[PDB]
């Protein structure tokens, strides 16, 4: 259990990002045509478009389930994103397995 404010940090390990094409929650927000891990500024469909800075090799993306936040490429590293949930109840962090 890790919380930042009232936002739960939810580590999700995937064998492959293709698993999320079949996920009835996460298929709505992922854009599978984009290279490198992204985060969403809002919860519009296909919102995960914003480039996470200096990502660790196995990081696949970040989904904030609520709130709105700053939307810039290569501005925030993973650890800085954890303070801008801005009302998100959950910050989903998708990882490559092993």
């Amino acid at each position: 259990e890790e919380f930042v404010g009232d936002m739960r940090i939810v580590n999700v390990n995937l064998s492959n990002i293709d698993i999320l094409k079949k996920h009835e929650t996460f298929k709505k927000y992922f854009d599978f045509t984009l290279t490198g891990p992204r985060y969403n500024g809002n919860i519009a469909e296909f919102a995960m478009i914003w480039k996470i800075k200096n990502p660790p090799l196995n990081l696949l993306g970040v989904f904030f389930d609520d709130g709105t936040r700053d939307d810039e490429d290569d501005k925030y590293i993973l650890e800085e994103l954890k303070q801008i949930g801005n009302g998100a109840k959950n910050m989903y962090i998708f990882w490559q397995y092993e």
Binding site: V12, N13, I19, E24
Partner: protein, 187 residues
């Protein structure tokens, strides 16, 4: 669509390494399945328990919070052997004491281990679940050289199955979530 409380019974038995970790394939399927269930109806609830380690552990009582559900499976332990009867009893009581009684009651068991129970034992459990209005989906995986296991699990299903509301899926070692996505566990 359907309104439903589901308890998922995880196999975190020492077996789950052998045969992607059989633990990891289970976690991914559970993740997609909690996705389908919470997305199809906002008032659906899903709970999670582990069957092996040093005994039956509830990681979460039924909830509609997907984050709580997926978080409580990060960093799963693996070991011991499943306690299937204790798992099902605890799953049925959790469903009995659901908040919204308008919810249908469903248990999902991932049977990834040898099944160390007689047919008669499992039929009795299956008949009690039926009298308690609980449906059962069984995922049979990891044939640890037990032609005995598949038979015993189909006998459990027969005793419970009602209105074709209960299902079994046998998956070969040679894509767990791809398989289930087209099976009624998903549909």
């Amino acid at each position: 669509p359907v309104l439903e409380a589901t308890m998922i019974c995880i196999d975190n038995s020492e077996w789950m390494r052998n045969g992607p970790s059989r633990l990891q394939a289970q976690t991914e399927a559970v993740n997609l399945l909690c996705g389908a269930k919470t997305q199809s109806n906002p008032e659906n609830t899903v709970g999670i328990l582990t069957m092996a380690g040093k005994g039956v552990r509830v990681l979460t009582t039924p909830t509609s919070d997907l984050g709580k559900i997926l978080a409580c499976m990060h960093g799963l332990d693996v070991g011991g052997e499943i306690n299937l009867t204790a798992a099902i009893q605890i799953a049925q009581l959790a469903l009995k004491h659901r908040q919204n009684k308008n919810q249908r009651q469903r248990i999902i068991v991932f049977a990834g281990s040898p099944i160390k129970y007689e047919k008669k034992a499992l039929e009795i459990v299956g008949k009690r679940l039926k009298k308690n209005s609980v449906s059962l989906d069984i995922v049979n995986f990891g044939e640890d050289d037990d032609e005995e296991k598949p038979q015993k699990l189909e006998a459990l299903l027969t005793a419970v199955n009602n209105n074709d509301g209960s299902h079994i899926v046998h998956v070969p070692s040679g894509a767990l979530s791809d398989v289930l996505l087209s099976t009624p566990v998903f549909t």
